Ligand binder design. Structure first.
Ligand code: ATP
Lengths: 447, 210, 429
């Protein structure tokens, strides 16, 4: 009775969106409040069921947010790994805002899990070293959720949530159990050398051609093919005497060493996520349609702009039901994301904010310079490059002689010609200025 | 920004005076109709459409008490405050502005003090010196007409969007008698009244009348 | 002599690479001020910087120790696998003042089992480095500051081997700087307080080059000495800074410390000579910092050569087109030269640089709406420059999606107005 009710509550069954299974009872982080949490004196944030991108200028805490979300997901991970398991704690020396009279830090996240239990108000707190009073963590509901998950899984195989944190260090240079998918989930995941090792291993396991290892390899290969610019991926052993990885990077058939480093990092991240999600979703036609929360710090790290302009075209299409929390520096990726899925910081902020709001200006499908001019407050031209101001000064010169050419303006026009070139758009602008001002003077003269 | 002709004052203003009452206590709807009469459904200085109705005092209430409740200073602005340019920046981001230095758009013509370049920038009008020149920069600094990267990117993107318009209009000058061409320029300056940054598009299609 | 005409530029001129790591034959010219290499993500550019670092290692080895044999090429990696020659040469020319305008070097390596021991010809570079070492030993002379900084500098964070001069060359090449050595050296300088001016120079350096940081100091708490900065007005430790902030601080501080020990006799030890290689100067940076990295670097190091790779249009928008070196997308057909971009980049639109120098459209083609505006143009020109149902629907879609003030909508309005005036004047004419 009760067990069957719980199992039906977790094993949500609904497939009508062109065959794309969706969970009736979706787990996802609905809100997150930070109080005296390393800069943030008090900061609320909301999230979307599909995607949320946090942008800033290197001092606006973006990896702090992902770190906190990971340190609260660690408790779910721990309590799905053995009852009474301990999760990751806040640091008592760094993670509490230095400028605080309270001297303690709080991370009051809150998760929505299905229509029935619409709130899971967990909270992770720590006091500063030397404070007699010590703040507790309101982890009990997290324990309850992880415990129901673990118990129902033990009594019957259950698709568990997939939690991942792909931080910056996934690029720095550095087996058959399902819960191995939780290993290093909230840190140290998505390394490329780990990935090649694991997948040469998987290719060898199925080399005979007689969760199945073949299914896992095929699913992760399809993930690679579908959410990365490369179109094919194989392991070539049974040629060259060594085991090399080969892709179709840009229509070629090359080794993965020829791939760009950023492409390699993104490849490792995608493969790691696909492997984890096929490990944690055994009862599912497409394991990639599983739930979970994936954090990605600087999704565009080491990727050429041409790759940034395509990264996120396939994250959701291949991972529909997982909440992506990304942070990024690039506007080129923003030219593929709706304003609905974007939160931004305010430059010139002391840290005592109250909420991060979406961009009023639609960033999806917009020019990188416009969504870099308004969203991120970056001029299309460097203010430090005097040449960029030249055209402006040109105007002044014209207006200084009733919009007509003279010695100084002609000298500046010569400078523009010499610097920018003859096909330069700046030169076309300067010619337009000259013509307009000249015949404006002529109108002024004849009337 | 456009000229306004103020009309019959609401009686509620005569019922509230500095010290006796604050602005919050006034019924905004008791004054909204009159506003709609003088500026229609368009924002007074900073020139949104009034989908987000906003009442502002040109002079700050803090420094300038008493005249807060008077009909003369009640206008519209960019929107409901509940940012870094137009109205707000004067008290937060600016420094020690000295009141009368700044140009007030309801007695003095802004064109006599500042003009709009085709690069989206705004500079003091050519030939200004002394305190007349001082008013020009200080209106840029206090209102942060340039320093706000959102403003420079919108003024510039507006003029650059119609720069080919100025090319084709002016290049046809010789092909048509003056009386016909001036009519084309008249319609050209007619539509910029109902568009953002009218003065920016006014100085790109004609001059500031230096 | 004026310290042998040393205290005259000191920089690299040319680099030839023959059958070396996929470079069948590639000659590169380099600018005395700043060269930037683009086109690759850092595969061939890493090879170029690695070859330059191998070449500089000989200068370091001979300035440090007499007869020092700097790094040699490798018979296993630094030789093109498919080369009838069966040896790899890394030749490079240097320019050091009016006298000795061409100091050559070759690092050669032949496979095992070849008749002639294809051998590096490092005699002249060794001779110049020995001149440096000898004249320095006789009298103190500021010396070059070679360094290398690859993607390995993104790494988490002994008085004898941190305070003594010539420690500036320790692990100077090879990649990630020794920021831990800088931390210890700075704490030691603070304990001592000539050291005062060095401390001040480093402080001003990383305060000016790094936007976020505004101050740096150390608290001498009894039992634990901490290095603190004022990041966005917050007094924090280095462990608290973001990845990009601390990575760039480590780069600049390592470089500044090396220059301060190497250039004790300069009034501004940051203006000493050197050849600093920097892979991906844009690492972990945001557009606003990209738009000022090179300006700040060139400001704090007036007289020094930078060979830096990059893949960001904002970075190129601050560098003269002469300084740029484009790899072709079809590099498989090995090319003997790296031509500068035809278009000027300095002072230009980041969008134009991205579109032409890098072949990246201003709006992504994966988004359907991204094409909408352009389509509208064509449609307007299809119906004799007049609206029809399709163009009206497209205009409504643009207005709904991008907004009412949308730059796209304003440009659509301008296009329709221009076309209507076209038709009106055609009727009138
Ligand atoms: N304990 C603290 N007390 C006060 N301020 C802190 C504290 N910890 C961090 N800060 C602030 O947080 C900032 C760093 O936060 P964070 O690393 O998340 O920025 P980010 O650039 O968005 O992240 P990333 O680039 O790694 O993705 C520090 O520069 C510092 O100003």
């Amino acid at each position: 009775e009760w067990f069957e009710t719980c199992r039906d509550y977790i094993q949500d069954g609904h497939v009508d969106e062109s065959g794309t299974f969706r969970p009736d009872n979706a787990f996802y982080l609905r809100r997150l409040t930070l109080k005296d949490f390393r800069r943030f004196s008090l900061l609320e944030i909301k999230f979307e069921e599909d995607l949320t991108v946090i942008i800033g200028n290197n001092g606006k805490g973006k990896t702090s947010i992902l770190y906190a979300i990971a340190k609260t997901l660690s408790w779910f991970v721990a309590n799905i790994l053995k009852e009474g398991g301990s999760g990751q704690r806040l640091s008592e020396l760094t993670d509490i805002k230095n400028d605080a009279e309270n001297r303690y830090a709080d991370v009051s996240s809150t998760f929505f899990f299905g229509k029935g239990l619409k709130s899971v108000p967990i909270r992770l707190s720590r006091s500063a070293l030397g404070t007699a009073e010590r703040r507790d963590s309101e982890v009990k509901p997290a324990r309850d959720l992880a415990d129901i998950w673990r118990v129902i899984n033990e009594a019957k195989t259950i698709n568990l949530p997939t939690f991942a944190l792909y931080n910056v260090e996934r690029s720095q240079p550095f087996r058959e159990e399902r819960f191995d998918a939780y290993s290093q989930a909230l840190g140290g995941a998505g390394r490329f050398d780990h990935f090649v090792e694991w997948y040469i291993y998987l290719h060898k396991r199925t080399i005979s051609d007689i969760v199945t290892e073949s299914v896992q390899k095929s699913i992760v290969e399809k993930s690679i093919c579908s959410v990365v610019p490369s179109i094919s991926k194989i392991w070539v052993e049974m040629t060259t005497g060594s085991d090399l990885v080969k892709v179709t990077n840009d229509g070629h058939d090359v080794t993965i060493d020829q791939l760009s480093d950023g492409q390699r990092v993104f490849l490792s991240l995608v493969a790691d996520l696909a492997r984890r999600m096929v490990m944690l979703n055994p009862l599912l036609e497409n394991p990639l349609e599983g739930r979970g929360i994936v954090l990605i710090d600087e999704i565009e790290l080491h990727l050429h702009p041409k790759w940034q302009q395509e990264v996120i075209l396939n994250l959701r299409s291949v991972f529909p039901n997982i909440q992506f929390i990304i942070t990024t520096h690039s506007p080129i990726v923003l030219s593929t994301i709706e304003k609905r899925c974007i939160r931004e910081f305010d430059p010139n902020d002391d840290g005592n904010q109250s909420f991060l709001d979406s961009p009023d200006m639609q960033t999806k499908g917009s020019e990188n310079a416009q969504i870099l001019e308004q969203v991120m407050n970056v001029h299309p031209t460097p203010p430090g490059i005097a040449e960029s101001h030249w055209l402006g000064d040109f105007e002044l010169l014209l207006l200084d002689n009733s919009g007509e050419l003279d010695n100084q303006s002609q000298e500046l026009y010569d400078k523009i010609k010499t610097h920018f070139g003859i096909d330069s758009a700046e030169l076309k602008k300067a010619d337009s200025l000259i013509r307009i001002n000249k015949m404006k003077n002529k109108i002024n003269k004849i009337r | 920004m456009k000229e306004l002709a103020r009309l019959e004052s609401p009686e509620i203003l005569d019922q509230y005076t500095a010290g006796q009452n604050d602005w919050m206590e006034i019924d905004q709807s008791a004054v909204w109709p009159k506003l709609t009469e003088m500026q229609g459904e368009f924002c007074a200085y900073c020139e949104c459409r009034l989908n987000r109705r906003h009442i502002e005092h040109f002079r700050p209430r803090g420094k300038f008490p008493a005249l807060t409740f008077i009909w003369s200073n009640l206008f519209g602005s960019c929107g409901d405050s509940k940012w870094s340019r137009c109205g707000i920046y004067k008290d937060n981001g600016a420094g020690a502005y000295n009141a009368d230095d700044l140009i007030k758009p309801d007695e003095e013509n802004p064109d006599d003090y500042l003009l709009f370049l085709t690069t989206g920038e705004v500079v003091p009008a050519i030939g200004l010196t002394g305190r007349a020149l001082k008013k020009a920069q200080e209106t840029i600094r206090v209102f942060n007409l340039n320093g706000d990267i959102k403003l420079l990117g919108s003024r510039r993107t507006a003029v650059q969007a119609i720069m080919p318009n100025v090319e084709y209009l002016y290049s046809l000058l010789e092909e048509f008698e003056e009386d016909d061409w001036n009519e084309m320029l008249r319609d050209e300056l007619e539509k910029i009244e109902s568009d953002e940054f009218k003065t920016a598009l006014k100085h790109a299609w004609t001059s500031n009348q230096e």
